[PDB]
Each structure stands twice: as structure tokens, then as C-alpha cells.
Amino acid sequence: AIKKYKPITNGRRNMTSLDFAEITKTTPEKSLLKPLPKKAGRNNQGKLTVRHHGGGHKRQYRVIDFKRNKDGINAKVDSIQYDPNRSANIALVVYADGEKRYIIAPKGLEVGQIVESGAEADIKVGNALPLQNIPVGTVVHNIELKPGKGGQIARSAGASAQVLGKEGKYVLIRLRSGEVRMILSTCRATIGQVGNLQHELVNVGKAGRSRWKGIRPTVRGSVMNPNDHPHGGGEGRAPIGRPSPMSPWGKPTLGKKTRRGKKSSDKLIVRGRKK
Amino acid sequence: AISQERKNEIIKEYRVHETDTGSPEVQIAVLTAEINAVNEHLRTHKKDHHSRRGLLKMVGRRRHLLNYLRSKDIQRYRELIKSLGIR
RNA sequence: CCUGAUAUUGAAAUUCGGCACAGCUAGCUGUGUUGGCUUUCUAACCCGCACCACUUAUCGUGGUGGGAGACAGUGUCAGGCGGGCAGUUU
RNA sequence: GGUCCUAAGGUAGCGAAAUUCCUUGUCGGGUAAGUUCCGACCCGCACGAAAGGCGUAACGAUUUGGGCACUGUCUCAACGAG
RNA sequence: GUUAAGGAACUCGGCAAAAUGACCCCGUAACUUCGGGAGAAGGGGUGCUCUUUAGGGUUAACGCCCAGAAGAGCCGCAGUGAAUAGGCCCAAGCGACUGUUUAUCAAAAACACAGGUCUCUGCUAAACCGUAAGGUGAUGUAUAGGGGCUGACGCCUGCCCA
RNA sequence: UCUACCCUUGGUCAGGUUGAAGUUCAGGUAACACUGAAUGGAGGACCGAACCGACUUACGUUGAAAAGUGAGCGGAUGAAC
RNA sequence: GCCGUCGAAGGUGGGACAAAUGAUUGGGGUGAAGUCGUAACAAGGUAGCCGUAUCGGAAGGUGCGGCUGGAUCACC
RNA sequence: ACUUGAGUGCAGAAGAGGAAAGUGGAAUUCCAUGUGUAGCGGUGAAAUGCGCAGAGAUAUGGAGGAACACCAGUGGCGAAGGCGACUUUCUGGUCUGUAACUGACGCUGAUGUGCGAAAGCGUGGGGAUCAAACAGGAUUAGAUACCCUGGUAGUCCACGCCGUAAACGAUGAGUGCUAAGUGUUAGGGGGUUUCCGCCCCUUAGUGCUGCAGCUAACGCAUUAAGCACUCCGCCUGGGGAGUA
RNA sequence: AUUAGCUAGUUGGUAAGGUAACGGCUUACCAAGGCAACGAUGCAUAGCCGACCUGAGAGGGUGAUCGGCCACACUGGAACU
Numbered sequence A: 001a002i003k004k005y006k007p008i009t010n011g012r013r014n015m016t017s018l019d020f021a022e023i024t025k026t027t028p029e030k031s032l033l034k035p036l037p038k039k040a041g042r043n044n045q046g047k048l049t050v051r052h053h054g055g056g057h058k059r060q061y062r063v064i065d066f067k068r069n070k071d072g073i074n075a076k077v078d079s080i081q082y083d084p085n086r087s088a089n090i091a092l093v094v095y096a097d098g099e100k101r102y103i104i105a106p107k108g109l110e111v112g113q114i115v116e117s118g119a120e121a122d123i124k125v126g127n128a129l130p131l132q133n134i135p136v137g138t139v140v141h142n143i144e145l146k147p148g149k150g151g152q153i154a155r156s157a158g159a160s161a162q163v164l165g166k167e168g169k170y171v172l173i174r175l176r177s178g179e180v181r182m183i184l185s186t187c188r189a190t191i192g193q194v195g196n197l198q199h200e201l202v203n204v205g206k207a208g209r210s211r212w213k214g215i216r217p218t219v220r221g222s223v224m225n226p227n228d229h230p231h232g233g234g235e236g237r238a239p240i241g242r243p244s245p246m247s248p249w250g251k252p253t254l255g256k257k258t259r260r261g262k263k264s265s266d267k268l269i270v271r272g273r274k275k
Numbered sequence B: 001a002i003s004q005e006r007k008n009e010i011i012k013e014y015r016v017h018e019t020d021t022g023s024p025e026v027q028i029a030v031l032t033a034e035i036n037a038v039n040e041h042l043r044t045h046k047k048d049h050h051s052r053r054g055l056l057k058m059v060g061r062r063r064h065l066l067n068y069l070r071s072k073d074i075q076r077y078r079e080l081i082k083s084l085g086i087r
Numbered sequence C: 001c002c003u004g005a006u007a008u009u010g011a012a013a014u015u016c017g018g019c020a021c022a023g024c025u026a027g028c029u030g031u032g033u034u035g036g037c038u039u040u041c042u043a044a045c046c047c048g049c050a051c052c053a054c055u056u057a058u059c060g061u062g063g064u065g066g067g068a069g070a071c072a073g074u075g076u077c078a079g080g081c082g083g084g085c086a087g088u089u090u
Numbered sequence D: 001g002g003u004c005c006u007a008a009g010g011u012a013g014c015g016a017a018a019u020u021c022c023u024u025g026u027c028g029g030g031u032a033a034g035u036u037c038c039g040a041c042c043c044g045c046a047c048g049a050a051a052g053g054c055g056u057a058a059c060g061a062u063u064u065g066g067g068c069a070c071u072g073u074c075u076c077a078a079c080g081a082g
Numbered sequence E: 001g002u003u004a005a006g007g008a009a010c011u012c013g014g015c016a017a018a019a020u021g022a023c024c025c026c027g028u029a030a031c032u033u034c035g036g037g038a039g040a041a042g043g044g045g046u047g048c049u050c051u052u053u054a055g056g057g058u059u060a061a062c063g064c065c066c067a068g069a070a071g072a073g074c075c076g077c078a079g080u081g082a083a084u085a086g087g088c089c090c091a092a093g094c095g096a097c098u099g100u101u102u103a104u105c106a107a108a109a110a111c112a113c114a115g116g117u118c119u120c121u122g123c124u125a126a127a128c129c130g131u132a133a134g135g136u137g138a139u140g141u142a143u144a145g146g147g148g149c150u151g152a153c154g155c156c157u158g159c160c161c162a
Numbered sequence F: 001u002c003u004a005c006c007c008u009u010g011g012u013c014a015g016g017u018u019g020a021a022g023u024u025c026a027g028g029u030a031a032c033a034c035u036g037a038a039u040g041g042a043g044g045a046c047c048g049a050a051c052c053g054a055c056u057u058a059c060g061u062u063g064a065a066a067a068g069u070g071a072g073c074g075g076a077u078g079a080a081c
Numbered sequence G: 001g002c003c004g005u006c007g008a009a010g011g012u013g014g015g016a017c018a019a020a021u022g023a024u025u026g027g028g029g030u031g032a033a034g035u036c037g038u039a040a041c042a043a044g045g046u047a048g049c050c051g052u053a054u055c056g057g058a059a060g061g062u063g064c065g066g067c068u069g070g071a072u073c074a075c076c
Numbered sequence H: 001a002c003u004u005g006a007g008u009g010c011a012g013a014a015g016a017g018g019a020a021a022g023u024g025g026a027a028u029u030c031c032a033u034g035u036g037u038a039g040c041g042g043u044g045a046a047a048u049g050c051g052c053a054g055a056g057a058u059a060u061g062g063a064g065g066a067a068c069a070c071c072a073g074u075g076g077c078g079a080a081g082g083c084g085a086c087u088u089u090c091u092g093g094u095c096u097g098u099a100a101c102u103g104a105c106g107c108u109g110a111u112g113u114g115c116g117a118a119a120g121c122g123u124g125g126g127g128a129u130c131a132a133a134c135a136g137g138a139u140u141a142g143a144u145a146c147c148c149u150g151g152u153a154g155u156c157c158a159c160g161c162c163g164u165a166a167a168c169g170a171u172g173a174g175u176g177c178u179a180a181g182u183g184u185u186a187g188g189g190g191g192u193u194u195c196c197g198c199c200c201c202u203u204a205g206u207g208c209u210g211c212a213g214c215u216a217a218c219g220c221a222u223u224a225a226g227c228a229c230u231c232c233g234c235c236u237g238g239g240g241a242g243u244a
Numbered sequence I: 001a002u003u004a005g006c007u008a009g010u011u012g013g014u015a016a017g018g019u020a021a022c023g024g025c026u027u028a029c030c031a032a033g034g035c036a037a038c039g040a041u042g043c044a045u046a047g048c049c050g051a052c053c054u055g056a057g058a059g060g061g062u063g064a065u066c067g068g069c070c071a072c073a074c075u076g077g078a079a080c081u
């Protein structure tokens, strides 16, 4: 779980780490790594879009198979490694063709697993097979959205989904945010819940390791004089004085919905969100 | 639990005396074959406590048989400690 | 930004109202014409959807699929929010 | 307890405060002597619960009052060197 | 640079100076998040010469460098004898901390912060730059991303929807 | 080419000091298993130069310098330069 | 007569325990009941009581568990 | 050396004794459409409220979470707190009959240590019903009161704590002992074992009625509050006070 | 016992010195012990026995004159015959 710390310093007063007991073979595989230069919000004009980014520690992207091809070949699981680009851990499967690849690792996985559409396809944790071939009440993750595209929905650490039922051409999926939604019946799904479940209790504990992860400070609005934030200065501290708290570009940020009338999402979203 | 087709084997390798189903030797040997098997239930299950009252009960029974055995035989008391590992 | 009206924009339907009074007992029936709501099919259009060629380029165009489909994107017009921004008065 | 009215019409906790005009509030401690300081009272001109309320070990080239130590800052100045 | 007697009486204010300063020892309170407080405070000893003995490594060993104990003795006003090196204590106020700020009259009690919440986003995501193409968000996908307020930890956060 | 964040590739920090997790041995355990002694070398940790800053004060103010020198002062294995 | 070991009293400093005292301050018993309500003992008119929370001027009221030391007809 | 106490072996049953994992039925609430439509509720009386924008009634639908009708009774079990749908793997103790077995191996327990009904708290999930706090209508001279539709922390699970109650049989444990009748539950003794027929007995829990005895009285009375033995815990007028 | 730890020359050998003699009796190198829930250590109250008082006795309360023993001399040390 989480290994705690003892308050020898005011920095390490309440800091709490995440114990690396589910990591085997800590060195990577030197044929599936691709370089990853950073950018802090610097698009193809050099300007600054999205704020609060940049710096920290160098990384190196690790090529992940989200497609789950190579039908009907038994894949062992060798070693469970660490991945900095994302919240889950990672796996190193070996297909019997000697084609070593990476899989995002579900909850308990060391044994050896199968990808096949409908042969028997062996519904267990780690096996990917399309949603027409999955019985109901079955916790899946890493679903595709468009057929043959690649697994998109629910890829986090400790995330999941749930197949509810089967409609006339689609299936019916309950997502992690609590939003029932129709997905086409030939999208794949890994069966299981993705591992590394103790992730959101990692108390960072210090403004320095919240700072070498690629985060910069975020100055509040009411301390900017009114050239650049609609919560401008005033003498002393001040209540906001608007009918609605505003983002730094005029739009009200506290309450107003933002999505627009969109193609192939109104006829599919049955229930909305629950928050 | 231990069955009564395998409990009888526990007696035979601890027969310093001949044809005795109850001794300061043989039931103590049976109790250890349960303590080593109750305490492996009690390294998988922990919320129960009625077993952990039977666990406390059986050992203090042996601590009275062993303290009787200290006060009869000099080299049989020390043998039974050395034979199973139990103190 | 939001929302209508038409253009690109086609067929199949099923009901529901305004006329028209067509039957001639407030409401029935059923034809000639008008405006809708829906429902389904594919031929435009659309895909930051899969292999395949130009090519030993995750750009592009060309090609059988699979999705979505006369809605969306877009052009003209019209209404409503709009100190996010401008010109000035006090 | 009566009664007017408002959409209900200041709860726990703090209180002459970085918040109190009059005011140098008032009684206690500190000094030979204390408009500043510390502990209390509460009649809050006008504290108050995420423009957070009340406490707090550790940390400060922070701000305010009192002790020992040391001294030309001082009573009171004099001499010498570049 | 030094100074008789006195030592904050000076002054907006102990401002500038003066004292404390090294190593080796004995000893150390309230208070607390049990790590801290703590160099807490208050104290003692150090120089040179001579006699004995126990301590590593190097080496066949005389030889060489590293050291610590008691005892005996000598001299000066003074033995880290010159230069270099913390003053400390009691009680409050604001901010938890290290950090960062007005290049050149303001370094803070302001800004950040780790944590608490609230709301928006089902993926060609919302958001932002750009008339558009293209990009950032991300080769990430609700344990993840953009924004509003409060600012560790502890105990808590009361009524009103005209 | 100064400064403000920022991307890719390098460089630099004398020394000395406390002693976090763990691991091993011993003591008790066989109950609910926790005390000591060694070893290990943790940290926006403490004292201090280079190095980076600019708190108090005196001088300078037709300056030696359109922002500085004298005595002191803070950070110094990182949110560093 | 001088030198040295041991040595009361004195002076310096941080603590440890009781006692005397102190602006205000919180409950407690005492009376005499004037002030405000009836919470128990009859089924005391909402049956009481023991733990444990939360609210109110005032006894106290409600929630979740246990007890009869619970009338009627003892709640068949 | 002895075998009545205490322990095991073998022969046998009765269990809501625990702990993980599945699985099943009936009711409550909320979402989808119809037929349908002015009332549904609530009450000493009434409303506040939901409804006419189509509520309740009424059907299929599907979403959840929680308890576990009938058996169910005096029954059972665990040292207590307590434990009632079913199936599965793992897991303690008690009892009946005794051929066996070493041969007093005991009882009590100051500190220690481990389980503890509910409420409450900490960090995470999930939230139908009931529902402190809370707003509302009237009952009241006054009303959180009692009464009514609403309602959050909480209720359920996993982990770590706090340990109190009318935690009660208001009766501490251990051994032997002394008039008897009547039930009930799981076992053993005498029958052709008549099957829930029967009486005849012996042992262990479980309730009722009742001598001698003891008691202030009530009432216990073989499961003693009787006669004795051992060891432990506590009390010494009522408040002040389980407070400082 | 609403006080649980306590002494450090403290516990012991050894050495020579030291008083009528034994002696941590006072000093020196080594050695790891003393005491303790059977009350060790620390506070407030006290001269103590033979006897006096009361009591059916067992016990409770007392310590004066009278005898035995003990300590002290306005206060705190140290000696000499």
C-alpha cells in the first residue's frame, strides 16, 4: 500500500509515498522506447496556450499496444514494469511469435493470456474480445470507441466500466463517471479492473515534488490588478463583486455548461452525469 | 482440523513408551499438529475470534502438561522440547 | 456563441391540424389543395474510421469496405444574449 | 410576556483587538514614575465562521513591550594615527 | 586606536560600537505534532620540559607516520597568549514551513505552497492561441485534464432561495 | 545579445556534523510478538568557503561608478546556480 | 614562618515540593422560596429508567440499542 | 506403587458457534409509455404539501440497496456481548456409551493480556427505507414538545480505534451434600424394539409447583438465597461526589 | 503506593596506608554488580522502653514525674590533655 514517512523535517511532515512492491525487472526493454521532448503549452506558433506546465524530469515514451491484434496466440506475462507517462503500471507480454509487447496491467496478472474474437476467448482478467461476445454484468476496461481504432475509454489507474445489456445494434456501457452510453457491438474490451489502486492517497507533502512532475504555480485571480483578470484589485482584500465568478477570459466558470450540439452523441447518451 | 486416519501417525513417531494413546509425550505431539494448523487458518482469516479463544485454550493446557513433565524426568522433558522445536 | 427561415437536398411512408364545406345527421364521414410532427431506407455530403497503392513518408490524393446519414458543416437573411473589446459623454 | 415588521432578522467561539469615534474605558500586574505592553470585565460607534472562526510545537535579515551581559550612545569631553 | 567614576541617564528606537566566538568535558527547563526544544541555559580545563605504561597500519626487523592516560616540575599580569569563528533569556502579535516579489527610495503580515472543497468536461473532450489550415490539452482518456475561492495540522463551519 | 518565463545539449558546490527507513544478531515470543545493541546513510535537514543574493548602517550624490566600495548579513544537495 | 591535600560559612546559577496570597471566574451546598414553567410517583395524562449522541431560557425533548425496577384484560 | 478427579484414544449423534466466497425469492423508492383522469393524501379536526404542465389509481419495464415472511415454540448454541433464507471450502467447543492409556498431571486467580450491544470518531466505497439536527401546518395563552407530508450526519461493507449499559439470574468461581410430583430437547439402558405406540430405567442441559431449613418480610427451596470447605472482588449514614 | 524504581565508590576483588580491631575505613588500575511489589527509594508527623489509661478479655489511646539506654548545650565546624 502506502509507505508513510516520519516527520524528521517540516517538509516530510505529512508526505506519503506509494510502495513499489508490484514492480518486477526495473530496467526497460531497449527496443520499444521512443523519445519524448517536452513543451509547456508551446504550440506551433511558440506562444502559450494551456497554463501551468513545464520542467521537472526527463521522460521517455514507452510504446503501448492498445489495438490487441494477434488473434488466437497465447501470450505469457513476463515482467511488470513502471511507466511514468500514465497512472497505471505496465506489462511485458510475449506472444509465442517472439513479438514482445506492452499491455496496461489489470489487477492481478502474472499467468498467461489470450486475445481472440470469438474462438472461445477465455473470459478472465487480461483477455480482450468484442462486446457482442461478453456476457452481462462483466467489469471491463480499455474499451474501444470506433471499431478497429484503439482502446480509449477507461484507461486510468483503478478505473473500470460495466456492461449492462444489449440493444438492437449497440451494447450499453456504464462508465466510471456514471454515464450510461451506447457503444458499437464490435469494439473490443479488456476484461478486468486496471491495477495500481492505491494511487489517489499519495500525499505529495511538499511543494517541490509537486513541482518536478511538470507543474508550475497557479496565482489566484483576486490578487491581479484589473488589466488581466476580471477579479481585479480594489483596496484591501475584496469579495468578487460579480454575479458569477469568471475565468480569466470572461466566461462564467462556476455552473454554466459548456458542450455543444454534437454529432453522434445525443442519440447515444441516455443518462447524464451524476455530480 | 486433523482427521482420525492421520492423527494416529502423530502418536507413533513419538512413542518413547509402548502402546500409550495418552502420555506426557503423545497428546502434546498431537496438540502441536493442531497449533501448526490452527495458526495457518489464523494467518489467512483474522476477523473470527471464537477460534482464537480455542487457540489460547489449547496451549495453556500443554503448558501444564509440560510443567508436570519438568518435575518427573530429567532427560525426557528435555527430549520432547528438542524433538519438535516447541519450548 | 445560441436559435429559426430558406439553398446545397433525394425517395418511402404513417398519422395529426388549418382551408376547402366534397356527404348533408356542436359534431360526425370522406375527397380535390396548404402547413407541420415523427418513422425508416441510401444516391449526395461528412469521418483527427480499418488494411491497400502512389512511396522502404502515422501529410496528402486515389481505391473495396465499416460508421453516421438528408441532420451536421457551409452561403445569404433575421431575431436574442455580448464591458470579452472598441469609440465618446458625464 | 405583549407587539410592529423582514425572505430568516448573528449560533459556537473570540472581545478597547493590524478591527473601539468619545477613550489616556475600567479594576489587577510591571516602574521611584507607564497615552505604548501583559491578564481579565463586555455597554461590540462598526468581530464572526472557506473575501474562513478559534488554538498551535517548529521556522523568521518580520513587528511590539521587559530583563541580565557589555560598552564614549550619555552626564562631559580630552589625546594620539593615516 | 585607547580612557578615570557611572553604565541606556542618550534617543522616534540600545541606531552604531563593546562583549559572546575554536576544540575537549560535566550538565541541561517549560513545552509539544514525540522527530523537536538545544550550541538551551549556566559551567570548568588548554603553555613549555622530563620520566614510566597500555593503543592501529606499514615492515623480516632497527626505522617511520597516527595518537590518547596519570604522575612530577618550571615560568609569566595573561598559556585557541597574534589573525579567523554564535551574545543570551521571559512574554505577546501575524503568517505554518524552505522558497519568491517592486533591475535603480518598499523584502513584508503581500505572492506561491502541501492539503480542503466547489463546478465544467464520454474524446475530433471542455479550455485557450490562430480570420482558416493546423496545433497545445496528450502521442493523456473521470484515481485523468481546464477554471473559481480558502491556504499544513488540530476542533469545527450556524439560520435565510423574497 | 539586457531582463521575463521556456525548450535541446553540457559544467560546477572546500570541508565538518547529526543518524530516518530498513537489514542482521541477541532477548523474549508460538499470546496480541515488541524492547536493546550493531550496521545502513535518509532529508526543499544544522554550522561554513567558492558561488549566487542585497537586510541594517556609515561614506559617496558638478561620484572612482546614470545604482557603487568599507564593516557586518541570508541561502549554500536544491522550488540551486 | 612559608608550600600542598581535606575542610564550616559565604557568594553565583538553574531547577524540584508544599504553603501564604491575587483582578476576575466556574460549579456546589445552605433559605425564604417572591420571580418563570410541570419533568417524575395513578397509564402522572407522550409509560419510566440505564448507556450514548445532538439541540433548548427552565426542568428536559428526540434518535438508535438493552431492561421490567411496564397499568389496562398484565400489552392473546 | 495405587485409579474415583483431570486429559487423550476408539463407537456415536444435535446445533441460529464462527469466517471468506457465490445465489435465490417477496415488499420499499426512482426513472419509460399507455388506458386514464379530478383528486391523492393525512387526521380530534384540519392542513403544510405533491396534482390539473396529466398526480395517485393502473399494467408490463428496468435501476438499485437492504433486511431475511411461513418453519419459529418453553427449542438450540457460545464463557459473555450475542447468533434465525440457502449451497459450498476452511474452523472451535460441548455431550452420550465406555473395553483402552501414561498415574494427582488439581481448584483459585493481586498485576498482565485478549474478545466488548448500540451510540460516537478517523481514512475510503455505496446510499432504497427508517430517520437526531433542520424548515414547515395546526393542536397550545406560549410549543424542538406529543400529532402530520418533507428532510442531512447516521443506518450497510472493508480497515484502524474508544471501551461504557438496568453489560441482570440485580445471585463470582470450584467440590461434595440433603422429602418429593409434573413437563420439554439432544442421547443411552428391559421387551416380538407396535415409530413418534408404550411403560420400565439411568445420565446431562432446560422451565414450572412444593417439605425440613434459612430469611426483616417478600420469597428461595437439587439450576438454593440450606448445611459446610478453598480462593478472589467489594461495602461501613444521606448529600457534597464518581465531582476536584 | 494520589511516589516506583534507586543509588554510583554505589556492589566486589586487589593494593598499601589507615583506628582498640574487622572494614570502601579513606584513596588506585581492573571487574558489572548492590536494592526492590516480601514496600527498595522520597515526603510530613515522633525521643524510645519498664510502666500509666481504659477494657469481660482480646484490644484501643498515651510516653509525666520514677528507674535503664540515648542523643543535644544561642548557631555551624574542628581539636588539644
Ligand SMILES: [Mg+2]
Residues within 6 Å of the ligand: none
Ligand atoms: Mg470603456
Ligand SMILES: [Mg+2]
Residues within 6 Å of the ligand: E040
Ligand atoms: Mg539560544
Ligand SMILES: [Mg+2]
Residues within 6 Å of the ligand: none
Ligand atoms: Mg526557548
Ligand SMILES: [Mg+2]
Residues within 6 Å of the ligand: none
Ligand atoms: Mg480546430
Ligand SMILES: [Mg+2]
Residues within 6 Å of the ligand: none
Ligand atoms: Mg548582484
Ligand SMILES: [Mg+2]
Residues within 6 Å of the ligand: none
Ligand atoms: Mg532579485
Ligand SMILES: [Mg+2]
Residues within 6 Å of the ligand: G066
Ligand atoms: Mg443483555
Ligand SMILES: [Mg+2]
Residues within 6 Å of the ligand: none
Ligand atoms: Mg457499531
